[PDB]
A paper describes a structure:
The resulting peptide/MHC complexes (p/MHC) are further trafficked through the Golgi and eventually displayed on the cell surface, where they are surveilled by CD8+ cytotoxic T cells (CTLs) through specific interactions with αβ T cell receptors (TCRs). ProTECT analysis of 106 patient samples from the NBL TARGET cohort identifies a recurring “hotspot” mutation in the [name] protein (R1275Q), together with its specificity toward common [name] alleles.
To test the validity of our structure-based simulations, we performed in vitro refolding of the [name]-derived nonamer and decamer peptides with [name]*01:01. This allele was chosen because it is a high-frequency allele in multiple populations worldwide and has been previously shown to form stable recombinant p/MHC complexes for structural characterization. Further characterization of the purified complex reveals a thermal stability of 47.9°C for the decamer and 46.7°C for the nonamer, suggesting that both [name] neoepitopes have a lower affinity for [name]*01:01 compared with [name]-B*15:01 (59.3°C), consistently with our binding energy calculations. The decamer complex crystallized in the P32221space group at a resolution of 2.9 Å. Finally, in comparison with the X-ray structure of the same peptide bound to [name]-B*15:01, the side chain of Arg6 is flipped outwards from the groove when bound to [name]*01:01 altering the peptide surface displayed to TCRs. Moreover, comparison of the decamer peptide conformation when bound to [name]-B*15:01 versus [name]*01:01, two alleles that share 51% of groove residues according to a pairwise sequence alignment, shows only a modest change (1.6 Å backbone RMSD).
Author numbering:
A (entry chain B): 0 to 99
B (entry chain C): 1 to 10
C (entry chain A): 1 to 274
């Protein structure tokens, strides 16, 4: 059995603007197997009302999933995405950038 | 529409 | 132009925690439309598109059958493969099935697919001719020869040429406002200095469908493979997708690089500059 570590992208659904509703996205992909834990963060604290997409995979049989949350971007609050997976000894933290 | 999965045991 | 329908099935065995859990998903082109979760409460195939629920009760209790049967078949297959390589009942293993079909602009038939995988690695697949199969390992050879005995490729063929093209036709014309849509990528550039001598230009293409895309940075119109960075196309969380491409420019030379976006829901390929 071989295992693949997940790709991660942390991004807003629409171009950010302070005081305007956006939605925070963490996109993990290219991972195997499918058991993965994703939390999204406003200043280090776990956000609860985060849904996710339905489990699918690509041609190389590696899975992908998107987790999103309601959020209004400020300029003091900057959000993050934490992920744990069997390939990771420590959970990865990928903070959100306005322009990535 | 999906398949009438029937001849598909390993 | 052409269109697709794909069904992705993943069933992973939960040893100790009762029965295997089993997920399945349906896509038309890059647009999901149905869902089923073994851990779900409804225990019934649910809709995720707006056009698929105009199908009456003829259909939901139909596919729910077609796919609980597939679920138990995947369970027994998990056991069979557990025995096939002398593997231990303690481990958690996965089985995944992709199958579907393609149509042309006229709704013709060009291709059908069915591929199986055991723990991320390919197991058995049915070739483009819908006649023979390929076996990756030597256990997929026993599954293969057994399937040649009962002529399973002919049943996968009667499906792939039959109701897959019928369903794909019907869904293409039923979600006509939603499935033949596009979105000309809304593009915009970005400039971020790092040194007093270099900056980064990020060519942005947002809100586009289908996922197919091509971003290319050029210098004096010479294609640039050198100091670039290219994301994988990301779902924007609303049926449309995002992508960007960055390059590192010597300051004062920003206007020598050009981004070129090649989307097909778009008549002429773009060219952007600072």
């Amino acid at each position: 059995m071989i295992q693949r570590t997940p790709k991660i992208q942390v991004y807003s659904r629409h171009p950010a603007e302070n005081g305007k509703s956006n939605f925070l996205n963490c996109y993990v992909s290219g991972f195997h197997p499918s058991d993965i834990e994703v939390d999204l963060l406003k200043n280090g604290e776990r956000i609860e009302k985060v849904e996710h997409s339905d489990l699918s995979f690509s041609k190389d049989w590696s899975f992908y999933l998107l987790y999103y949350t309601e959020f209004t971007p400020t300029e003091k609050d900057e959000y993050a995405c934490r992920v744990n997976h069997v390939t990771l000894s420590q959970p990865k933290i990928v903070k959100w950038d306005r322009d990535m | 529409a999906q398949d009438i999965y029937r001849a598909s045991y390993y | 132009g052409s269109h697709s329908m794909r069904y992705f099935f993943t069933s992973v065995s939960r040893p100790g925690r009762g029965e295997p859990r089993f997920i399945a998903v349906g896509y038309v082109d890059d647009t999901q439309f149905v869902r089923f979760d073994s851990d779900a409460a409804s225990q019934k195939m649910e809709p995720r598109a707006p056009w698929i629920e105009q199908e009456g009760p003829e259909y939901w209790d139909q596919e729910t059958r077609n796919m609980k049967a597939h679920s138990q078949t995947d369970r027994a297959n998990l056991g069979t493969l557990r025995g096939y390589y002398n593997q231990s009942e303690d481990g958690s293993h996965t089985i995944q099935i992709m199958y579907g079909c393609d149509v042309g602009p006229d709704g013709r038939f060009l291709r059908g697919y069915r591929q199986d995988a055991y723990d991320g690695k390919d197991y058995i697949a049915l070739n483009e001719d819908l006649r023979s199969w390929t076996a990756a390992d030597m256990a997929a050879q026993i599954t293969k020869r057994k399937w040649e005995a009962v002529h399973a490729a002919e049943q996968r063929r009667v499906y792939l040429e039959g109701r897959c093209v019928d369903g794909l036709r019907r869904y293409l014309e039923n979600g006509k406002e939603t499935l033949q849509r596009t979105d000309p990528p809304k593009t915009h550039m970005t400039h971020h200095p790092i040194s007093d001598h270099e900056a980064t230009l990020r060519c942005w293409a947002l809100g586009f469908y289908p996922a197919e895309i091509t971003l290319t940075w050029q210098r004096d119109g010479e294609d640039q493979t050198q100091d670039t960075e290219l994301v994988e196309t990301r779902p924007a969380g609303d049926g449309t997708f995002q992508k960007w491409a960055a390059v590192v420019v010597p300051s004062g030379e920003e206007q020598r690089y050009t981004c070129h976006v090649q989307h097909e829901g778009l008549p002429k390929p773009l060219t952007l500059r600072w």
